[PDB]
Amino acid sequence: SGFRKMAFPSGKVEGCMVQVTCGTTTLNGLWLDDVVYCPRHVICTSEDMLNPNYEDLLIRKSNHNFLVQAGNVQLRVIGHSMQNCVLKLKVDTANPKTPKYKFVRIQPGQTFSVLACYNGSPSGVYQCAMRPNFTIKGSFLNGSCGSVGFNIDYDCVSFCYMHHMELPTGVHAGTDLEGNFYGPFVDRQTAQAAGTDTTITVNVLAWLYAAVINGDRWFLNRFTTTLNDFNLVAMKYNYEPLTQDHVDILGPLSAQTGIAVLDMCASLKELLQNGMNGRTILGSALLEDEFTPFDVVRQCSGV
Amino acid sequence: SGFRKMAFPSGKVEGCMVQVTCGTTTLNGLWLDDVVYCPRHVICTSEDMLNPNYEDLLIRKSNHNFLVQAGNVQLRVIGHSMQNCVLKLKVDTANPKTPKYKFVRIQPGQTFSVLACYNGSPSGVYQCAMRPNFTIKGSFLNGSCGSVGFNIDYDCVSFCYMHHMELPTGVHAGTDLEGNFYGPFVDRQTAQAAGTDTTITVNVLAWLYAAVINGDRWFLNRFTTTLNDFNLVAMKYNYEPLTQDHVDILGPLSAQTGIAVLDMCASLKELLQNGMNGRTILGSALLEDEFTPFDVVRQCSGVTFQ
Numbered sequence: 011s012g013f014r015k016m017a018f019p020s021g022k023v024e025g026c027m028v029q030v031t032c033g034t035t036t037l038n039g040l041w042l043d044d045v046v047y048c049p050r051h052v053i054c055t056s057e058d059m060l061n062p063n064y065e066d067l068l069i070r071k072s073n074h075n076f077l078v079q080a081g082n083v084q085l086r087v088i089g090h091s092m093q094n095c096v097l098k099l100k101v102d103t104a105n106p107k108t109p110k111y112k113f114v115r116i117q118p119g120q121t122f123s124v125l126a127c128y129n130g131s132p133s134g135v136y137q138c139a140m141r142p143n144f145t146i147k148g149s150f151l152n153g154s155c156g157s158v159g160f161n162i163d164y165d166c167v168s169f170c171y172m173h174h175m176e177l178p179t180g181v182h183a184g185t186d187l188e189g190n191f192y193g194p195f196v197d198r199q200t201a202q203a204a205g206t207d208t209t210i211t212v213n214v215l216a217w218l219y220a221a222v223i224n225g226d227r228w229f230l231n232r233f234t235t236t237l238n239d240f241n242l243v244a245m246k247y248n249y250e251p252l253t254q255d256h257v258d259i260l261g262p263l264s265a266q267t268g269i270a271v272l273d274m275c276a277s278l279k280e281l282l283q284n285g286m287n288g289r290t291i292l293g294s295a296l297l298e299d300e301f302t303p304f305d306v307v308r309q310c311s312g313v
Numbered sequence: 314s315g316f317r318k319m320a321f322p323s324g325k326v327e328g329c330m331v332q333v334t335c336g337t338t339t340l341n342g343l344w345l346d347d348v349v350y351c352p353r354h355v356i357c358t359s360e361d362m363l364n365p366n367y368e369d370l371l372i373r374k375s376n377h378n379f380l381v382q383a384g385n386v387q388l389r390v391i392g393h394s395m396q397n398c399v400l401k402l403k404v405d406t407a408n409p410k411t412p413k414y415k416f417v418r419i420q421p422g423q424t425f426s427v428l429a430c431y432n433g434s435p436s437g438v439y440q441c442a443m444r445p446n447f448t449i450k451g452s453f454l455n456g457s458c459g460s461v462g463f464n465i466d467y468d469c470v471s472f473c474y475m476h477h478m479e480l481p482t483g484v485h486a487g488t489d490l491e492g493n494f495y496g497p498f499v500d501r502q503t504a505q506a507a508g509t510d511t512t513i514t515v516n517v518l519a520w521l522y523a524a525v526i527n528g529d530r531w532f533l534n535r536f537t538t539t540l541n542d543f544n545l546v547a548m549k550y551n552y553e554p555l556t557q558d559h560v561d562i563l564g565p566l567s568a569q570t571g572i573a574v575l576d577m578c579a580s581l582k583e584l585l586q587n588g589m590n591g592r593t594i595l596g597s598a599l600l601e602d603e604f605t606p607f608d609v610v611r612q613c614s615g616v617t618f619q
């Protein structure tokens with residue numbers, strides 16, 4: 011029993027982390043087979059941060075202008091190319107620890123583990139949720155670019171995030187491993203704003219299930235609602251719409267607890283309208299939405 | 314910027330996790346050099362679960378009765394001894410992925426990373442605190458026994474916890490890697506209660522410093538207080554007393570922020586007495602106590618491990 015923000019073990023991703031340096035700019039890269047993936051602005055000089063001409067900066071660079079270090083031993087670069095906002099440095103050695111892996115693009119509402127790195131070395135690992143406005147709420151300092159986010163299924167590592175940026179509001183933005191930003195952001199030394207954020211309704215309900223399973227039950231009531239009427243209350247409080255697929259995905263948790271999804275909706279509606287009035291749920295005084303149904307089942311189901 | 318509950322990189326430890334089976338019990342073990350460490354109740358049958366006599370159970374076991382699996386590879390057991398609540402099973406192969414390591418026993422209020430495992434397979438990693446009542450509030454299901462907690466101290470993996478038990482209240486209890494329990498607990502199938510818990514004052518202050526470094530400054534005030542006067546209110550709200558040693562440990566963060574420890578002590582007592590009046594700190598509407606002062610320094614200074 012118990013519930014915590016839980017990352018996937020980072021061992022497989024640790025074995026692919028390297029540093030990449032060009033001039034006085036150092037950041038992290040991911041070494042998979044004989045390719046190192048890193049953000050492309052490693053090739054920028056400070057004199058041209060406002061709108062870098064990447065195409066054109068990259069042709070002026072040679073393989074020897076790049077320093078790649080895997081655990082402080084240098085990896086020789088024998089070719090380089092750009093794909094969207096990521097740089098691909100082909101090196102003379104295949105990473106002997108490359109895991110089975112996939113590059114995937116995640117949907118807002120999904121979670122992944124972040125391995126925060128500096129100078130090619132890991133600092134720590136934590137979980138994040140991709141928000142509806144395509145930002146994440148992480149812990150990243152200068153030098154952390156090229157840190158990756160990931161999930162693990164059996165033996166396969168699905169890389170879904172590569173870190174690039176911290177917005178003026180203090181949240182974080184990045185790309186998939188093909189160089190395409192999540193959200194409308196660009197890799198320029200410029201202040202950019204995110205869309206308005208919303209709460210991930212299906213995740214809040216998954217968390218209420220985790221609470222019930224763990225003994226926290228004071229918010230449950232004797233009522234139910236329809237999907238259409240609940241969504242009217244959800245819109246009113248800046249919550250995402252709850253879909254029929256969201257109802258089916260919560261089926262396992264509904265089956266384990268015996269509480270129907272639409273009954274949990276009625277309890278949430280009450281929580282939205284009346285607040286918590288000083289009570290807590292699973293140790294929190296606010297309604298939490300960075301746990302998916304998958305995250306809850308992985309931890310709370312022996313069943 | 315930003316501040317999150319962050320576990321240590323779990324790679325060094327993943328490569329040490331194995332499965333141990335004896336009779337009907339499968340649980341996790343720790344494979345370092347040529348020894349596999351695991352909880353001793355793996356030799357137990359369900360009969361006489363209320364107070365097993367482990368000394369006798371072990372003599373009727375042999376090396377061939379212990380099945381150790383490291384992934385697909387079976388490790389031949391060539392010797393076995395019991396040490397407090399752990400079994401030390403000598404195996405015929407030394408783990409080529411043993412890290413630089415230490416066994417240490419931690420104190421209440423210190424934090425560590427837990428690598429939750431089931432049947433030898435790592436499932437997840439999270440951060441936990443040794444509470445003042447020698448429990449941890451973990452996330453453990455059946456089969457998790459033998460999962461370990463650890464810190465990386467500069468370059469050395471210091472194993473400090475091996476999981477054994479879940480109490481009726483839902484919290485968890487375990488041992489050091491020498492087999493001695495944290496708290497007043499025993500490895501027996503019985504309902505056991507823990508002492509009342511308290512809040513770890515020094516860690517809450519460390520978290521207030523983390524908040525400042527990250528821009529939250531509203532709870533700062535111009536009042537002042539003494540440690541004796543602070544402790545008098547701390548006791549009213551169930552906080553551990555703040556000692557001078559605790560004040561010394563907040564020294565580095567006081568320097569980085571330019572806020573003296575006792576002015577932060579004044580800020581915390583106002584918080585306890587008056588609440589946050591709808592406000593939040595590092596996104597939280599409650600006060601956190603599972604970050605040590607070094608946890609704050611590690612994270613806000615980008616400390617790495619290699």
Ligand SMILES: *CC(=O)[C@H](C[C@@H]1CCCNC1=O)NC(=O)[C@H](CC(C)C)NC(=O)c1cc2c(OC)cccc2[nH]1
Nearest residue numbers: 150151152153154155174175176197198199200201314
């Ligand atoms: C490369 C790297 O590690 C940093 C990571 C940033 C740094 C600030 C602290 N947290 C963090 O995650 N990435 C960058 O510095 C970005 C480089 C771009 C070319 C991708 N820049 C920003 O993240 C950035 C720039 C900027 C700005 O322009 C002057 C105004 C306000 C905010 C802002 N953030």
Ligand SMILES: *CC(=O)[C@H](C[C@@H]1CCCNC1=O)NC(=O)[C@H](CC(C)C)NC(=O)c1cc2c(OC)cccc2[nH]1
Nearest residue numbers: 011453454455456457458477478479500501502503504
């Ligand atoms: C060894 C193992 O894998 C589990 C881990 C426990 C199991 C329950 C779910 N979460 C968790 O952490 N540990 C055990 O089963 C313990 C074995 C002992 C010999 C150490 N026993 C308990 O955890 C336990 C037993 C028990 C009880 O016995 C009748 C009554 C009330 C509470 C209780 N906890």
